[PDB]
Amino acid sequence: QRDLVSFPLSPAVRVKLVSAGFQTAEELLEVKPSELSKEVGISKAEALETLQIIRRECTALELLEQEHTQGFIITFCSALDDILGGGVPLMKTTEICGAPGVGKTQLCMQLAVDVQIPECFGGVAGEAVFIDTEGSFMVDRVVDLATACIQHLQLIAEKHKGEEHRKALEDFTLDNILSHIYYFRCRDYTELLAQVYLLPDFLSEHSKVRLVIVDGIAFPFRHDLDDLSLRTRLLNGLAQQMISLANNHRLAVILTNQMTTKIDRNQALLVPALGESWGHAATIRLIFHWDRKQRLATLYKSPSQKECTVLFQIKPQGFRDT
């Protein structure tokens, strides 16, 4: 016995059905549509729609095999990969927070470049989708990062002196890697929601995409939005849609956040913005902050590893160690 409330039917048709004495989905399957339609005063089209929507409504070993057969996305940071278990995990939503100038955008560019590394070197060999909300995407920086990756991979392959490594690196050229990054631009949050809604079919046609980046999510939602409840509902819906998409399409998702100041008594602490309930949305959360002239990466929340602190650096080659 399945209640009608458990189905995504129209409120009007459900009101009519409960008026006519309908409370179970099982009894609906044994009645001709004409008789029920003339009894409840419902036209043929919506009756057929109700009939079809009613009709339409993986052991852990397989999960282990799937997790092991697909790798992580390397960040060119050995310690960060070690504390992440191998890099950014697929099927998981990741969040990055930090004060301006720490290097969130550099990390996003590095990930977009690295996601196309051939699997012979431990990569995923997939495309990337970059969504920009603040206009901080500079092509020259991406070119520099791609050239640095080219040089590093070429040196590693030459030192190892294999055979299939050279073949894999043959097609791994600047034009090929630059042609596999898809760029979108959103100004208002309505445009971001529209692009999110269009994402499923686009990923369906572009089945080789293995990365989705949304650089800047606090900016579209922190200005000219007085109603806090509406913002909370929109953010919850966006998080649910993003995790559903990431799991369905075998994707790694990275979101970028901004810090804010919380004042208690007479001392101030830097905390991530967008309220407290937003903390449950991200599967993995990282925080970048300054200490003297050193940059530190802290794993704040994660259901697989332990809290750690990592020293990283930004160089002309890009995101690196030390």
């Binding site: 458990s6 282990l64 407290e276 332990k306």
Partner: protein, 311 residues
């Protein structure tokens, strides 16, 4: 009315009784049937017999207390959570047939506790367990680590993992669909005695309920109540151990910690566990606070110290 459900119904009487109402059998049972014999023309002796048999097959009959006592003496059971602190906190494990709710802050302990309990039940008792992951917070490497911490035989670990089933539901409708599918398949498979599921864990109910709430609408609250009713009937009418996790909110007027999803959801579970992180000294790591906020067999307000990094 419906045809073929009970004997004695004629194809003429069903359209004859159209005079009063057509909605449900409540028209037949909740009417003054004396006037029906002349309003439409019916035999008195057949009408009462039909009403009696229909009421018999379409209701429930009370069961004496002694019979229920005896049957629970041989049916119910208790399943340990794998943590001595929790076990001594809630009397050496949770009881099947009730609803257990775990409430905590972001990242405190909920998913880890659920995973460790599932690993214990799958290995220490050799029973099937279903996991409903909604927020994506379930990695198989954590389960493998817990199983390695328990035993070392590879085949034992594989067999224990083979009793764990995971389903993904990112909205209320998918969760309702999978729960109703489990209800149907178990109710149909009552004849057998192998492969049954005794514990089902919902990773997060706030993930699929919060978008519906907020505003002046009513459908979200009705859907939440329907999900609660389904979980309660699955736990009680079948004798299963259900564990769900929920978020925690900070009140505005009073500033006290309060479970999410509101007052209507506040009455749903029977046993409440609250997890908090110990600030200042002893922070981080596994060191955390476990408290009992609601129980039908223990006084509330008690305190207990537990760790989530020693298993």
């Amino acid at each position: 009315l419906r045809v073929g459900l009970c004997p004695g119904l004629t194809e003429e009487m069903i359209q004859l009784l159209r005079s009063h109402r057509i909605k449900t059998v409540v028209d037949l049972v909740s009417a003054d049937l004396e006037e029906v014999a002349q309003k439409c023309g019916l035999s008195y002796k057949a009408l009462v017999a039909l009403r009696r048999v229909l009421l018999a097959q379409f209701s429930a009959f009370p069961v004496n207390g002694a019979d229920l006592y005896e049957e629970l003496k041989t049916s119910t059971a208790i399943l340990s959570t794998g943590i001595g602190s929790l076990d001594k906190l809630l009397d050496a494990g949770l009881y099947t047939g009730e609803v257990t709710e775990i409430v905590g802050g972001p990242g405190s302990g909920k998913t880890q506790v659920c995973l460790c309990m599932a690993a214990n039940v799958a290995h220490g008792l050799q029973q099937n367990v279903l996991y409903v992951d909604s927020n994506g917070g379930l990695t198989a490497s954590r389960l493998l680590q817990l199983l390695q911490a328990k035993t070392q035989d590879e085949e034992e670990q594989a067999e224990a993992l083979r009793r764990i089933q995971v389903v993904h539901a990112f909205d209320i409708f998918q969760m309702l669909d999978v729960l109703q599918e489990l209800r149907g398949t178990v109710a149909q498979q009552v004849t057998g005695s192998s492969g049954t599921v005794k514990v089902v864990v919902v990773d997060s109910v706030t993930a699929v309920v919060s978008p519906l709430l907020g505003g002046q609408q009513r459908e979200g609250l009705a859907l939440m109540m329907q999900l609660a009713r389904e979980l309660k009937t699955l736990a009680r009418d079948l004798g299963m151990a259900v564990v769900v996790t929920n978020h925690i909110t900070r009140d505005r007027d009073s500033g006290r910690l309060k479970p999410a999803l509101g007052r209507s959801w506040s009455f749903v579970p029977s046993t409440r566990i609250l997890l908090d992180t110990i600030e200042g000294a002893g922070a981080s790591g596994g060191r955390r606070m476990a408290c009992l906020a609601k129980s039908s067999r223990q006084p509330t307000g008690f305190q207990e110290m537990v760790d989530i990094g020693t298993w």
